[PDB]
């Protein structure tokens, strides 16, 4: 599924990401935009053999288990396939555990490069929430 900007903002609000651990909602919508272009089925194979899954491109080496990644740790205790659903529940649950580490949202490279330091609130403006 490819979410519309406002559609995802509303969904993420229902999923409790607005002001989760100090991060305003715009951060999450902006992150999804540059990490997967709002596509829940997005996948990206990496060099180390790991793969980034879903709307928030969660990595198979540290966060989810896809059974094909070397030093996998499955920190989110969830199969990577669960992060490829049109239902964002699992991706949000895992994203919350990720951001709860001291590194915060810096875990998301696209967010760090295209969102951090920008007017992230702009990503939820002009939306019925």
């Amino acid at each position: 599924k490819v979410f519309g900007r406002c559609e995802l903002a509303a969904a993420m609000k229902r999923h409790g990401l607005d002001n989760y651990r100090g991060y305003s909602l715009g951060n999450w919508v902006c992150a999804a935009k540059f990490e997967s272009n709002f596509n829940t089925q997005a996948t990206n194979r990496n060099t180390d053999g790991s793969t980034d899954y879903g709307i928030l491109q969660i990595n198979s080496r540290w966060w989810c288990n896809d059974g094909r990644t070397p030093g996998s740790r499955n920190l989110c205790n969830i199969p990577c396939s669960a992060l490829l659903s049109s239902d964002i529940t699992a991706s949000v649950n895992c994203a919350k555990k990720i951001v709860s580490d001291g590194n915060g949202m810096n875990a998301w490279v696209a967010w760090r490069n295209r969102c951090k330091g920008t007017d992230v609130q702009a990503w939820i403006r002009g939306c019925r929430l």
Partner: antibody
Amino acid sequence: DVQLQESGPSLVKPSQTLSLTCSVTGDSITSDYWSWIRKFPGNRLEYMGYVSYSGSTYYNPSLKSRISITRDTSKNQYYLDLNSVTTEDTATYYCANWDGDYWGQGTLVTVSA
Amino acid sequence: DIVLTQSPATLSVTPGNSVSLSCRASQSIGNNLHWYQQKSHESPRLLIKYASQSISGIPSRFSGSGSGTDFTLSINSVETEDFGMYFCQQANSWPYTFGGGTKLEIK
């Protein structure tokens, strides 16, 4: 599967450092975030803090920075140190993973002269 | 910190009847409210995560609902095994905090 178990002295003196150990069996401590929670008499629960995969820690401000949570991979254990305890630190201490799925049995520690 | 207030403090019920426990937050926390059960001499047990998400291994009679500041834990037809303490916990902001708890007893 995973199992957690607390260990350490049950009786401590005021002003000393209270230390507890949580032994994890079934998986590596490097694969989760680990926490400490305590229950005071009167059914009052307090989340003490947790250590995440990067080694970063989050401590409850209520503890006035008297707490330290560390890990030992080689022994697959993590620890709790609480400095300068007072009778107000008497409670049942539990270790559990961040998700809340795995908990130790809990251990009562009494602070008394 | 975010303060969680639970009510009633105690609730007596006859097995077979249903009950609902309340937990209200001092500020909006979205769906970031979790429910725990605790019996004397035992460690807490997670019943519901993120306000309404089910947990594998927990009886289906337990369900959670709510968002923002008002949440409830419902038990459809209480069983004797359900008597004990119930606590809500929020993980929206650090430090995580717990509600004062509700004691469910047999009537």
